[PDB]
mmCIF file of C-alpha atoms in Angstrom:
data_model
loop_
_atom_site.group_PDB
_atom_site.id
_atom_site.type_symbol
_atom_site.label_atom_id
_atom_site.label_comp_id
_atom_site.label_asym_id
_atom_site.label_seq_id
_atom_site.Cartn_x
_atom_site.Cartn_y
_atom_site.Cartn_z
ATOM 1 C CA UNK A 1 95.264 111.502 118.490
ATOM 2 C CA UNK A 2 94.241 109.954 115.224
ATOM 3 C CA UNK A 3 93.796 110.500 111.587
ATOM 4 C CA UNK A 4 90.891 111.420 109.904
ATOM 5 C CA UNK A 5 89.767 108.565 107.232
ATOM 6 C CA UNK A 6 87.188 109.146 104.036
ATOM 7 C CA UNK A 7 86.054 108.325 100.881
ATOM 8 C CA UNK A 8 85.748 104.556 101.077
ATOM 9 C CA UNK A 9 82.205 102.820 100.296
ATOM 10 C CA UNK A 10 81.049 100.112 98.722
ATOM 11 C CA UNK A 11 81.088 100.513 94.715
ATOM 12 C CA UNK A 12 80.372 98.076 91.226
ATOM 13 C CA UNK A 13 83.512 97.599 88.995
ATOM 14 C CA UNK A 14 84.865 100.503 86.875
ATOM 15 C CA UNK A 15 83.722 103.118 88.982
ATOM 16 C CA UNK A 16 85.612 106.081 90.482
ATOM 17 C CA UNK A 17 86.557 106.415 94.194
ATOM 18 C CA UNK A 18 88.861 109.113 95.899
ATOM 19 C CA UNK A 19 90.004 107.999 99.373
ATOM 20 C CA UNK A 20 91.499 110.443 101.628
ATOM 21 C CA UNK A 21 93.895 111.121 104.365
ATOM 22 C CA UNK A 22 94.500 114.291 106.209
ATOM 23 C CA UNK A 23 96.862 114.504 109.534
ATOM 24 C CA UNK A 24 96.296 117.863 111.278
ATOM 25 C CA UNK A 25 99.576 120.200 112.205
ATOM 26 C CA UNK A 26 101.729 122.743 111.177
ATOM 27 C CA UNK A 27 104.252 121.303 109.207
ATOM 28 C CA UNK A 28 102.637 119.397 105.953
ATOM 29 C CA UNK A 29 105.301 120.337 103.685
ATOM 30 C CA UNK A 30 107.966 117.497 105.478
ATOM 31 C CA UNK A 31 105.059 114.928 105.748
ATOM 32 C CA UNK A 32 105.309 111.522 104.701
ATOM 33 C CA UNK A 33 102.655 109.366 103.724
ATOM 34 C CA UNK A 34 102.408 105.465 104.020
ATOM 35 C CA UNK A 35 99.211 103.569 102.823
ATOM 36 C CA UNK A 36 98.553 100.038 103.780
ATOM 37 C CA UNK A 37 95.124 97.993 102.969
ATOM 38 C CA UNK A 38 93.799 94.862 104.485
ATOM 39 C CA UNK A 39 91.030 92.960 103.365
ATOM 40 C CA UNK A 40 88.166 90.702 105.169
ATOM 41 C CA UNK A 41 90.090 87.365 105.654
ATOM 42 C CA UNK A 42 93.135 87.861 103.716
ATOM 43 C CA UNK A 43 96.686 89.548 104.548
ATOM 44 C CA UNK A 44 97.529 93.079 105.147
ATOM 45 C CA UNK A 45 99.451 94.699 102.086
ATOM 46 C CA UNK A 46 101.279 97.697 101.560
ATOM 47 C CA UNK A 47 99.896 100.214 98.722
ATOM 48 C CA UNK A 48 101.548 103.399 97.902
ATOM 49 C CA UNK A 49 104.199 105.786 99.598
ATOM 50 C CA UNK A 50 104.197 109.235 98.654
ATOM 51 C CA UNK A 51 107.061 110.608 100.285
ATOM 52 C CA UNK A 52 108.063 114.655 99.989
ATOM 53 C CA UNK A 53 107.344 114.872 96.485
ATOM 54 C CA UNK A 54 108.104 111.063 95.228
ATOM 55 C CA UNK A 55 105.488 108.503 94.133
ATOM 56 C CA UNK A 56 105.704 105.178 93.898
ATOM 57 C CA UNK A 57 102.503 102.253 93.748
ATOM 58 C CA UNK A 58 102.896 97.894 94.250
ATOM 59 C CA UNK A 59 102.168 95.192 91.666
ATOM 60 C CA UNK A 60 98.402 95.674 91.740
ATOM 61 C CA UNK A 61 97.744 99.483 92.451
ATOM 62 C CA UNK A 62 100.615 100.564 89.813
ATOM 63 C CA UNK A 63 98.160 102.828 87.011
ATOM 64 C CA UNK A 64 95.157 101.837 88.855
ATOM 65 C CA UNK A 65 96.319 104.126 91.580
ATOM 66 C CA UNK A 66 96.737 107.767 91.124
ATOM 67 C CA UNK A 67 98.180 109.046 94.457
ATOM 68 C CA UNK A 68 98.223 112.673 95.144
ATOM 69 C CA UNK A 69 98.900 115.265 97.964
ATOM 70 C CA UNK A 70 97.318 118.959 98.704
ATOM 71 C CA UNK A 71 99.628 121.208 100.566
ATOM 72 C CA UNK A 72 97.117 123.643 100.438
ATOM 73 C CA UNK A 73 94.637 121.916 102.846
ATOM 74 C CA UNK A 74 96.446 119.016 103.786
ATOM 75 C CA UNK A 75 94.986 116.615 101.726
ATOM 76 C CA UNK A 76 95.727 113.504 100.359
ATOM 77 C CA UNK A 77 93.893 112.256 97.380
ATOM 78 C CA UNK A 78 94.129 108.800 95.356
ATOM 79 C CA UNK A 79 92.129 108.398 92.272
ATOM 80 C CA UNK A 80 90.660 104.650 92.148
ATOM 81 C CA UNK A 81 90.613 103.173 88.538
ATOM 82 C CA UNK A 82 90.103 99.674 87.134
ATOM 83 C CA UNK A 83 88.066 98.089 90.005
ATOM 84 C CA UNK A 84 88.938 94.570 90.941
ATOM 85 C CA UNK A 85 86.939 92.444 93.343
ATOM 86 C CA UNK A 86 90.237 90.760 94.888
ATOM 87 C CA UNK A 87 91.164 94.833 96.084
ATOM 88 C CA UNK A 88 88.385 94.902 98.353
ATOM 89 C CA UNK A 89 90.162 96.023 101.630
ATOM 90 C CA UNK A 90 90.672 97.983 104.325
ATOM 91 C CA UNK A 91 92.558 101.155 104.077
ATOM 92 C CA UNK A 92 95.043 102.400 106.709
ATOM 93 C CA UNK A 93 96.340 105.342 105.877
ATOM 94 C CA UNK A 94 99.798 106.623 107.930
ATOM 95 C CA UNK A 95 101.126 110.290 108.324
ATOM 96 C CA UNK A 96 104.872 111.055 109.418
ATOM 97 C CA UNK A 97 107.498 113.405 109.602
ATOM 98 C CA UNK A 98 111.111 112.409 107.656
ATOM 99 C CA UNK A 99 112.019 111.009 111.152
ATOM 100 C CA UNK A 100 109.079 108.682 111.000
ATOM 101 C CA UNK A 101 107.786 110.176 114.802
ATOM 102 C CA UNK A 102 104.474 111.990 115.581
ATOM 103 C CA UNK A 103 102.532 108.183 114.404
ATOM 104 C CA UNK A 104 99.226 108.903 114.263
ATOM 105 C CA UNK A 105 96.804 105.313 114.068
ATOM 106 C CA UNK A 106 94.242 105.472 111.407
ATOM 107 C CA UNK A 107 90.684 103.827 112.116
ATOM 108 C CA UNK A 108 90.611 102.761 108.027
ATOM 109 C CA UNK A 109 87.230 102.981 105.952
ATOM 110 C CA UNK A 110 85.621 100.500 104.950
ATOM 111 C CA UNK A 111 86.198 100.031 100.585
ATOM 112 C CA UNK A 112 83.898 96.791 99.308
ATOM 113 C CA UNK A 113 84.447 95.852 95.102
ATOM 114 C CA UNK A 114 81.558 94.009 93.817
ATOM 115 C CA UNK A 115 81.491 91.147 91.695
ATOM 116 C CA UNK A 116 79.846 90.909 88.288
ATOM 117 C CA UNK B 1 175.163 108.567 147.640
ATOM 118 C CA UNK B 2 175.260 111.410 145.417
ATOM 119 C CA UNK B 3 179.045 112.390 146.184
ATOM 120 C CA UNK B 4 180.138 109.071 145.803
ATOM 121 C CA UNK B 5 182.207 108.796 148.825
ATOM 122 C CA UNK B 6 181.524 107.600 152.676
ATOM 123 C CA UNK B 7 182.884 110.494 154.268
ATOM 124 C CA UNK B 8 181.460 113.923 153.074
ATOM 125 C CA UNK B 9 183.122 117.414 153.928
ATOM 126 C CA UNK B 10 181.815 120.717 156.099
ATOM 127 C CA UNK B 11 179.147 122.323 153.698
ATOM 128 C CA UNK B 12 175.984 122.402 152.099
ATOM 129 C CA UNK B 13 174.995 119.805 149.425
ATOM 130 C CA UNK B 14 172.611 119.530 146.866
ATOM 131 C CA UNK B 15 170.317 116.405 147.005
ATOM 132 C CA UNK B 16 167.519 114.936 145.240
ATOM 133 C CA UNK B 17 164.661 117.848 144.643
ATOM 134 C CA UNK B 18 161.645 118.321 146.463
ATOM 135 C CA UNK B 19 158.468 118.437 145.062
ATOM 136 C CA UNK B 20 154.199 118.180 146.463
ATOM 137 C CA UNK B 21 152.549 115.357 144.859
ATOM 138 C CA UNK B 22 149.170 116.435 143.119
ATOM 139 C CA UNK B 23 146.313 115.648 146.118
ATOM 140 C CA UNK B 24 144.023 114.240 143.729
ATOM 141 C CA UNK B 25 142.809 114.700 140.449
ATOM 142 C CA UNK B 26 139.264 117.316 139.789
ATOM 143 C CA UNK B 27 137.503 117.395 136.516
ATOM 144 C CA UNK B 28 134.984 120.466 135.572
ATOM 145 C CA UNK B 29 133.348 120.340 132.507
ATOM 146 C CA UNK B 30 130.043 122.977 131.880
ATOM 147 C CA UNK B 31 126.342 121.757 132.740
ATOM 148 C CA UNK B 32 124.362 120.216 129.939
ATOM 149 C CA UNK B 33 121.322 121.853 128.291
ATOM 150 C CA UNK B 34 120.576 120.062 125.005
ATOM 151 C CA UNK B 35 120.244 115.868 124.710
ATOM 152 C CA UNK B 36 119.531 113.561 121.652
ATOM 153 C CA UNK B 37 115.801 112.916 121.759
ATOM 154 C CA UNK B 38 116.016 109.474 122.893
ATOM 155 C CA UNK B 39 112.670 109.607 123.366
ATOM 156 C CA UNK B 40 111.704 109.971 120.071
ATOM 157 C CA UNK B 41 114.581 107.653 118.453
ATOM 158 C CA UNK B 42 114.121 104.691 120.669
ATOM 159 C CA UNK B 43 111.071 105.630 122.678
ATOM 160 C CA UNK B 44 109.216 106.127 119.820
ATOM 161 C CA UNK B 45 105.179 105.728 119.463
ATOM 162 C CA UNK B 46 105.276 102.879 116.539
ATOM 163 C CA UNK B 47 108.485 101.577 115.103
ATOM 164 C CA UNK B 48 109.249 101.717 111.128
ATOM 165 C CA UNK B 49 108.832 98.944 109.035
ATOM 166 C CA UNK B 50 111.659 96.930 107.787
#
């Protein structure tokens, strides 16, 4: 069907946001993650792949992104630190299997940095 | 031919054998149950990335 998108909104710098991804089933512990974000008029860029239990961020999320998974509810959670007005994107957020079937879309939330 | 002569005596001669050619060749192998899933290697709902 689709994934369920939250915790995007439009924030100041230096504040704290927690965007998250959870893809409904039965098997979360072989899940794979892929995260992608596209802002308003520029290119889409990948962001962070947390795959079985390995994590791994770009040039501009490395530290500033905290990815993290919840096998308990099937949650994905990344901590947002050190704001930066050129982030503000779009957030499509991917769920697969280690074949890389059952592809869910994402609709993406909508994740606005403001200037100072 | 095979006594090497043009005039054979009274008897009974061994020749050349006889044998029945194979009618045509038959292959049976068991039905099939399980297949790769195809459908999920190549038919699959969004391709990878490279």
């Amino acid at each position: 069907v689709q994934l369920q998108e939250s915790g995007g909104g439009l924030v100041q710098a230096g504040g704290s946001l927690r965007l998250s991804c959870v893809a409904s089933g039965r098997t979360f512990s072989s899940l794979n993650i892929v995260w992608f974000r596209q802002a308003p008029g520029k290119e889409r860029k990948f962001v962070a792949a947390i795959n079985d239990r390995n994590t791994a961020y770009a040039e501009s999320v490395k530290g500033r992104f905290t990815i993290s998974r919840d096998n308990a509810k099937n949650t994905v959670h990344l901590q947002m630190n050190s704001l930066k007005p050129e982030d503000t994107a779009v957030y499509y957020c991917h769920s697969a299997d280690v074949n890389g079937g059952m592809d869910y879309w994402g609709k993406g939330t909508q994740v606005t940095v403001s200037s100072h | 031919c095979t006594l090497k002569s043009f005039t054979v005596e009274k008897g009974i001669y061994q020749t050349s054998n006889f044998r029945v050619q194979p009618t045509e060749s038959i292959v049976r192998f068991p039905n099939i149950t399980n297949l790769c899933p195809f459908g999920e290697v190549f038919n699959a709902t969004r391709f990878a990335s490279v």
